[PDB]
Design a protein around this nucleic acid. Structure first.
Ligand SMILES: *O[C@H]1[C@@H](O)[C@H](n2cnc3c(=O)[nH]c(N)nc32)O[C@@H]1COP(=O)(O)OP(=O)(O)OP(=O)(O)O
Ligand SMILES: C[S@@+](CC[C@H](N)C(=O)[O-])C[C@H]1O[C@@H](n2cnc3c(N)ncnc32)[C@H](O)[C@@H]1O
Ligand SMILES: [Mg+2]
Lengths: 284, 255, 255, 255, 255
RNA sequence: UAAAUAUAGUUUAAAAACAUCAGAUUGUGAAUCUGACAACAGAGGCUUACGACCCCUUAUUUACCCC
């Protein structure tokens, strides 16, 4: 198209532009309908390759330092197979969790409210969240609900996980959480909820919205829990923490770690350690 | 050789029992499918041919098994082999502190009645039928093969009832073999691992796939035909008695 | 140490259960004798002093055990140890060709109900009681000790029912230990050999002397105090879990 | 099916090994008789026909086994099955107080070297040979079958050395199966009891004849062909792995 | 009671042997630390006081053990208890197809020599020493306690040599108990799981944390004092004989 | 209404460190290797550009509630 030549002049002005831009990145530049929108995307591409180059340069340096060290230069009970063994042990715990674990629902019904960038970050947070659950002493039985098979969220999940996706010990379904669990057992977590959570209940199914709203959309999560008459709760952030700055909507990885701590008989002081320290001045 | 032998196969309408029936009938034996009226055993018996009949019975019932053995004797004249493959399981923890949930006594009782009491009920009645047989040249009147599980040795979380029932089958294998030794009835037990049966298919697919991947070799669910092959080997080998054979691909079940 | 611990001992009015109560009470523990109303447990509890109470219950019934555990909680405030020593036996061959006699299903069921189902009934209910305990310094909330038999491994002629029940206890020891591991309840099983329990001391002297002579060393019937000593060792040792300990003087039972 | 398979049979000039060779060759397999130079294996190999060759070797020697496996590869092109049937026994008490006699260390060492170390020596070397095989449809590269004894579980008086060696074979069966699972080599162990081998006939006639009556059923010494039959069953069944099968007619050895 | 008893503790300079020595000496027994000269056995014996002496010996050597036992008799007058805790562990796969690496025969041999042959060497020589004791009121002349491993039952990848040696100890426990039963020497075996011995505690903290989490309950490495406690329980209990006790917190090792 | 503020895994600094995901049968620095991810609240602009500056939205905190 004309965009291939159009970007060329932008480089000459030194507007923080990457040297190499792949064709699939040019297609994403089509979505940028404004000068500012393009500027933010190029700045993203610039910083992406710059940290790639910086880490790569540190890789040849690391590789060179390793080979020089080796050139200069017993009874065991176990072979060193720990990473493999730990993965196997987690799988057994995961298998047990899918049969007896407490359900935790990640509601994937927020694709329409998220742009490309936000959807990417949602999957990153989901990857981290699942990892913390997998390694836990008492994992949740994670449910991915309202996950459309052909949707962008599903496609990105498959891309990040590759062949691991079919082997993840979680339940991913197109069906809603209301179709899988009794409505009285469902508690929809949202910071906008009027009801402040006091205790972690083991007989309840907590629902977390898979929704990274950098462009903040308050009440979207609460509205979903009111369209279908579901109970809502919010974290007692004000009750326990002297809040200073920042959004009170925490990330997915922070939420699951808070819930995991609470499920394992941790108190609110231990659980709220996963709230970013930059957002408060301590436990009141 | 199993040619001409008559086998009463408990739970023979599906899973391990059906695979045992198909193999034995294919090898020239006669089979009686002992299973519940709703099991669909009539269709399986018709499919296997004239050397297979369906005997509707509940193994927990003395009268039901007596009727089935009378049917077996009426059609084929004798009983040479009994294979106990009927079994149920529950997935229930003994006690869950977080949920405040206790394993039901009725759930434990139901599993024992079918798996353990049902097996013994068949054993004690088929032994009487086998006792009427004239001994062969080796002095043998019959072979009884029971189905335990690897859960009898490493039962998982939630498998207390199943493990108790299967551990009971393992426990009574040698005494019953000793009981029936004077009259020439061999008693053997197979402890299958993870097999492609409805008992395992009911689990979530992802759980089934992970468990199958954890079988050292071959890394797959057991094929029911493989169980049937071992059953035939036990029948043919006169010196296997009072033993439990693990058929599990070397798996050891974790919690 | 067992000082200050509260133990619920099923079948505690006689035999292994009584010896366990006498030792634990002598070592400073509190005992609840859970036995049948006609067992004479009231006299034994009175003999053992103020730190022992009699709780009439049938282990096979949920209501009776619940009442007994409520009595234990009311009297002593908590339950730390459960010792399952309640049990019966039958002597009956699976099938006797000469006499044309078949083991009754009722006899098999009765032994299973008391030995196996009764044990599980106590386990599942006491686990809920021990679950209410605050974990100790080692994270432990309780210890459950079951009584299997050597018959679970080499059951004699006529011991099919007993071997099945005891094989069931052995089978479910590990899964229940796995079930209760997050709660911090250790589950252990003792498999005693020939002990000088009232059942064996009432057996004919001809059989009794021979069986005592068949123990490699010491060549005598097991003293119930020796069972009690092992029970205490299990309670005191925090790392014994999910295991069956044979207490038999190295005997291996003949047919 | 074993047709076309190549089996290396240790101790194949007599006893269990020879019977295994006769069966497998009769079923269309090729056998390599690995036995001592003075064992008379050359005559046996000639008797079994063109599909059988004699490879003189001492299993305790790495070089001897390497030469034998090279002979097997040269003659038949591959190795699919290894059957470890070489073994020795010694009758010696650990300590005799009356005679003031102590078990010699060298007697214990010699039994371990042949039975236990010799088995491992063959396993570790044949695994390399089987590793060169292309996996079959089921991913299998070979099958290794070891011969333990019932002495691994109920060792008699004077069988300390033998029981240790056979207990070692049982102990390492699972780890080796786990070791070779990625390669697709199944590892199985047979634990025979009281077979009509020349070893058992070397005992006094009165003792062996009494031992025959001590087998519950059939009340006779094990036929070596019955061992061979089980070996074939293990080879044919893809899902038998990491397990010990007792082939003993339900006997449990007394002191 | 262990007061006044003399214990010969093999491998007593560290780990399970040292913990056993500390407990027994603390309970009023006399201990002889039998360990290699290069071990800090002399310092440990001096630390434990006048009731503990260091006897440098290699368990694989008949002469070394004879010298150590003579030292025990000279210092304390008799031997009442033998605890075999000396051992080595190697990790080596049987065969590695990708690397083309085969388990060394020498690696297998050296593990057997120390773990299995060394244990038997001590047993056969201490039995002679214990045979000279006057029997107690119970007819007992001594107690021998061996250390197997859970690897005897579920050996992991790379544990073939270790599992064989430990499986050999398990195998010979009953026959030796039967051998020494007329003499009145009890033979018992402990199969520890994961214990916080220096060999395990030297691992990276990431590995130590993972191993602790693998134990169902308590979710920690075994304390060597817990092993010592079980040793004392075995010594005090006259009816424990010919048995293997798993001390493992209900763990079952994965491949 | 006003003023400061706002790091979407975390923190530090004005780009790193720690983390995350996939692969690994690791001989005990795997203490590694190969990949994946890379967005300082959001939108729109200005400017040679800047994280600068100018606007609007949302959110947080502290004051203040009608002139
Ligand atoms: O101009 C706004 C707002 O600045 C002012 N206002 C709101 N709350 C306060 C307050 O507590 N103290 C003072 N001094 N001034 C305040 O009032 C105006 C109108 O109110 P808002 O627009 O903030 O609120 P409204 O309910 O109208 O909603 P919306 O217009 O924002 O949608
Ligand atoms: C970053 S929030 C999404 C915020 C969005 N504006 C909304 O309406 O919720 C991602 C999810 O985490 C959960 N969550 C985040 N912060 C929370 C809080 N403080 N209390 C309760 N749930 C919270 C909610 O389920 C939410 O959907
Ligand atoms: Mg954040």
């Amino acid at each position: 198209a004309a965009t291939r030549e159009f970007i060329e002049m932008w480089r000459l002005l030194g507007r923080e532009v990457p040297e190499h831009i792949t064709e699939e990145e040019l297609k994403t530049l089509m979505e940028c309908v404004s000068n500012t929108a393009k500027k933010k995307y190029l700045k993203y591409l610039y910083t992406k390759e710059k940290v790639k180059k910086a880490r790569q340069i540190k890789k040849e340096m690391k590789a060179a330092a390793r080979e020089e060290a080796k050139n200069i230069k017993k009874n065991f009970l176990f072979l060193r197979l720990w990473d493999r063994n730990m993965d196997i042990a987690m799988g057994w715990k995961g298998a047990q969790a899918m049969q007896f674990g407490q359900p935790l629902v990640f509601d994937m019904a927020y694709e329409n409210y998220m742009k490309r960038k936000e959807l990417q970050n949602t999957v990153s947070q989901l990857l981290e969240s699942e990892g913390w659950n997998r390694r836990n002493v008492d994992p949740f039985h994670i449910y991915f609900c309202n996950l459309k098979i052909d949707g962008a969220l599903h496609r990105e999940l498959v891309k990040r996980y590759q062949e691991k996706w079919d082997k993840l010990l979680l339940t991913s379904t197109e069906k809603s959480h209301v179709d899988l669990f009794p409505k009285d057992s469902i508690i929809y977590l949202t910071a906008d909820s009027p009801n402040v959570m006091t205790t972690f209940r083991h007989d309840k199914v907590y629902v977390i919205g898979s929704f990274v709203d950098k462009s903040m959309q308050p009440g979207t999560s609460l509205a979903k829990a009111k369209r279908l008459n579901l109970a809502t709760e919010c974290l007692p952030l004000d009750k326990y923490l002297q809040w200073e700055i920042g959004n009170k909507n925490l990330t997915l990885d922070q939420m699951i770690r808070i819930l995991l701590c609470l499920k394992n008989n941790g108190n609110w002081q231990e659980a709220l350690q996963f709230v970013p320290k930059r957002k408060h001045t301590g436990f009141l | 050789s199993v040619k001409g032998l008559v086998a009463v196969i408990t739970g023979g309408a599906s899973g391990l029992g059906l695979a045992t029936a198909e193999r034995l009938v294919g090898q020239g034996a006669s089979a009686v499918l002992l299973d519940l009226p709703n099991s669909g055993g009539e269709a399986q018996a018709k499919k296997l041919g004239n050397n297979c009949v369906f005997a509707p019975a509940d193994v927990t019932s003395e009268k039901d098994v007596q009727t089935a053995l009378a049917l077996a004797k009426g059609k084929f004249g004798r009983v040479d082999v009994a294979v106990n493959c009927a079994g149920i399981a529950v997935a229930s923890k003994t006690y869950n502190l977080k949920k405040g949930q206790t394993h039901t006594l009725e759930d434990f009782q139901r599993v024992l009645d079918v798996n353990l009491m049902g097996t013994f009920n068949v054993i004690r009645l088929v032994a009487g039928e086998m006792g009427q047989n004239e001994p062969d040249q080796g002095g043998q009147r019959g072979v009884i093969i029971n189905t335990a599980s690897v859960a009898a040795f490493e039962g998982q979380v939630g498998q207390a009832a199943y493990s108790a029932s299967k551990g009971g089958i393992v426990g009574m294998t040698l005494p019953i073999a000793r009981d029936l030794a004077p009259i020439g009835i061999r008693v053997m037990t197979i402890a299958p691992g993870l097999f492609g049966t409805p008992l395992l298919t009911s689990l979530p697919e992802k759980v089934c796939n992970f468990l199958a991947s954890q079988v050292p070799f071959p890394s797959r669910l057991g094929d029911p035909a493989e169980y049937a092959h071992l059953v035939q080997a036990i029948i043919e080998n006169p010196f296997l008695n009072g033993e439990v054979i693990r058929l599990d691909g070397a798996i050891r079940m974790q919690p």
